[PDB]
Amino acid sequence: DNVAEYRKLIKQVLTEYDNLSRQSPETNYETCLVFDENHDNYLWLAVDWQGSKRIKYTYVHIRIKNEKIYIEEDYTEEGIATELMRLGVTNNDIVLAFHPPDVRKFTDFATA
Template sequence: MVGEDHKNYLLLTVGYLKGKRVHACVVHLEIINEKIWIHEDGLEDGIALDLLMAGIPKNKIVLGFHPPEVRPLTEFAVN
């Protein structure tokens, strides 16, 4: 799913599992100030690895699911 502004990208899981309804956000990316913010990452290996393999440098990826005080401890952009 892509937002109308083409700055929000979602990967959702929707359906039924063992008779229970499932609706969850697996991945949420947002483009803010020419950087990719990862707000939610429920993939086993992480979407950041896929972005790096696609040629996007670490200084253009923000791990937004981490609190601001933790982000400087990563190798990725802070904001």
């Protein structure tokens, strides 16, 4: 399929994370989901104000590139990769792109 299935899983996981996160004890900021199936980029963002302090950061950025799931940015506690594996994505189809290219071979995931 396999990219078509990955798109469905990524969007499903980010959407559920966004909803589930509203029950956190930790401070809840306003969030945004940004899914683009043409450029194959998927983001979960915090976009808010704390008085006059701007809250603006990225929880997760995933890109589908080279027929694989490139995790470009991930500040979740357990890691998106853990959830993807639980949903049946093989480690060979996940790239921890938030790690420098030259270290990926020392991990349990694909280099590219």
